[PDB]
Amino acid sequence: MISKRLELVASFVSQGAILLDVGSDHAYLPIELVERGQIKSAIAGEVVEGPYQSAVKNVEAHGLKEKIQVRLANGLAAFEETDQVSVITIAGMGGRLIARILEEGLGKLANVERLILQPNNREDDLRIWLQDHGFQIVAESILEEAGKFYEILVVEAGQMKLSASDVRFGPFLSKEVSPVFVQKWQKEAEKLEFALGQIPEKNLEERQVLVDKIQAIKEVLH
Numbered sequence: 630m631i632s633k634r635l636e637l638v639a640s641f642v643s644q645g646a647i648l649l650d651v652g653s654d655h656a657y658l659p660i661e662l663v664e665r666g667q668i669k670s671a672i673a674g675e676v677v678e679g680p681y682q683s684a685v686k687n688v689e690a691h692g693l694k695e696k697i698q699v700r701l702a703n704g705l706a707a708f709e710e711t712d713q714v715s716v717i718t719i720a721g722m723g724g725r726l727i728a729r730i731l732e733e734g735l736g737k738l739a740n741v742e743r744l745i746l747q748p749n750n751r752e753d754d755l756r757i758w759l760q761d762h763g764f765q766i767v768a769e770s771i772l773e774e775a776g777k778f779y780e781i782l783v784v785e786a787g788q789m790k791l792s793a794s795d796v797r798f799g800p801f802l803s804k805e806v807s808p809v810f811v812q813k814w815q816k817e818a819e820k821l822e823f824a825l826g827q828i829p830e831k832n833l834e835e836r837q838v839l840v841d842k843i844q845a846i847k848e849v850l851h
Contacts, residue, residue, distance in 0.1 A: 637770055752799070769802045780802065818850075821846075
């Protein structure tokens, strides 16, 4: 019932966890995880009425009302200390929206062991946010799906100090340089090389930003 993207997210969900899945997609991830004996129970948060009702019905269809609660609430409003959530997944959103949800519920995160985050974009700004709020990345994965590329960041409480290069490329991804990582950044290099092809020729400052981006990529791929 889940895609390769969410299956990859799933693989970081610690055995025995109590899970909060934020904006859960039809509750398929938590349903799947409980059905395979991987977690004890879950909360699926949904902020809109449609996705809320679909998550409620899927959980009911699967007979898992005793193990998965579905709550109508925005982001981290879906849980409280008393829920004993140990893992939170937040997947399928832009990275700055992930940061906004983490920021608004920042006061509840101290007793969560692990966050698994799959930003659709702005991964760099999410890594800055994490670092500035007392979180460290402890694993990263990257996949391709229908011709697009998705990063997954695994995070636990603690300090990190990222280089500009780790901010942009990922401290784990830039070390592995997997075949999928190469396709993503190579494709991004050619996009940049094409755009810098357009804009000419004066206004150096402007072309410069694109030039530095291209070298950064060349360096991390060497």
